Amino acid sequence: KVFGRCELAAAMKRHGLDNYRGYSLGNWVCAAKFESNFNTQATNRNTDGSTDYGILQINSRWWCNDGRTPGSRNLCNIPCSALLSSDITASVNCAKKIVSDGNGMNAWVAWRNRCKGTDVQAWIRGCRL
C-alpha cells in the first residue's frame, strides 16, 4: 500500500507515535517519506547482505528475521515480511523499540540527513488530526 501524506499521519498518531520519546509527528512522516516514499512494500538490500523492510526501512541485521542474514538478531521478534503489510502496526511497534535504544531517530539515515533540523511540522500541515 502507498499511503497518502495525511492518511499516514493519522495512522501514526492513532498508534501513539506523536511525541513518542519526544519526537513530534512531523518527524515520523518525514522519515517515512524519504525512507520508503510512503510505500509499505519497499525493500532495499544492504552491502553486508542485510535487507531493509517496509515504510520505515527496518534492518534485518538487528530487528527482524528474513532467514538470509547469518549472525543477525531478531530484537522485535517478528518475521521481516510482517513489516510489509498494509497494516503498519508491526512497523510502528518495532520502531518504538528502535528509537528507545539510545540513539533516537538517528538510527534512520534519511531522517538524519533530510529531516533533522528542518521544519518537520510542514509534513502534517493541512492534515485533519
Q: Which residues are catalytic?
A: 35, 52
Query: Could you say which of 27, 40, 60, 91 contacts Na ion (CB under 5 A)?
Result: 60
Q: Which residue is nearest to Cl ion (CB)?
A: 26
Rounded distance between C-alpha atoms, residue 54 and residue 20, angstroms: 20
Beta carbon nearer to Na ion, 12 or 84: 84
Task: Write down the H helix ranges in 1-123.
Answer: 5-14, 25-36, 89-99, 109-114
Query: Could you say which of 27, 59, 72, 91 contacts Na ion (CB under 5 A)?
Result: 72
121 binds, among Na ion, Cl ion, none (CB under 5 to 8 A by kind): Cl ion
* DSSP at 19: T
- Residue ranges binding Na ion (CB under 5 A): 60, 65, 69, 72, 74
